[PDB]
Amino acid sequence: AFGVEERNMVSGVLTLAERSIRSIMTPRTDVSWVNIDDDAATIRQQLTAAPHSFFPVCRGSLDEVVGIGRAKDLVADLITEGRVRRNRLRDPIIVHESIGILRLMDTLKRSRGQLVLVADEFGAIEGLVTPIDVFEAIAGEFPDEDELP
Template sequence: FPVCRGELDEIIGIVRAKEMLVALEAGDNVAALASASPAIVVPETLDPINLLGVLRRARGSFVIVTNEFGVVQGLVTPLDVLEAIAGEFPDADETPEIVIDGDGWLVKGSTDVHALQQALEVDDLVDEDEDIATVAGLVIAVNGHIPRPGDVLELSPLQFTIVEANDYRVDLVRVVKLRQYNDEEE
């Protein structure tokens, strides 16, 4: 974990969770422990190839990413870089974003629209000019507001049935190809 003085942009160093818990239980100074392991900080403009070399020096940990003003933007792990190159690796407890469900698919609202188009072999669900990235964003745009569970929306060649949603977001959608689209394919 990064240990900071007052605010996120003042990083003292890095401490492993186990070390921090032992230090806290013993009443030791966590800041002193953190200063023994300084954070590795990189600019957000660093290219991925050079970032790999920096991550090797971090010995499997992570590096802190800052912008041109030194403001922390986040952190990067070796897995983040690998996923940027090779695509997302699902966690052991992570369910797939698109699951076959009878004659359709159950799709998480957070699923990328382009991933849905590729998986279902359809095109042009979204215009390139539109700022829609997820399935939830797509059904909200089509509906004009956040739909409720049970709402059915059509966007040729697909039909979307809202399975799980609340006042703030769409979590799960059932998608089927419209009949006339299936007939045209054959």
């Protein structure tokens, strides 16, 4: 009744509680984030080149997060107003890496499509996670358009 795919997924589920958030998250070095101080042309190019829809919007560096922006809203602001509208950003959802995957899933269920940032106590961004990252731990890779197929 069941085959290799199911067995692998069941194994995945039974190891979630042992794996770290660090092991599944998109790491700091691969975070795509918008520097609100960049010029409109630069940001616009970045938004179209990335496969992602939500972006931390920050002032000068990744750790200086002002909010989370939706690409489709950001592009509109940048074209018509020449800058990101700060008051249109969503509040970040942020967790510590130590909470583990089961607790993180509860948070992701409440995040309504928004990425979750992983940060230390001093506010340093360690990475970010979405439901896809957890699902991959169960069912295997769903690579982005700019990742190996």
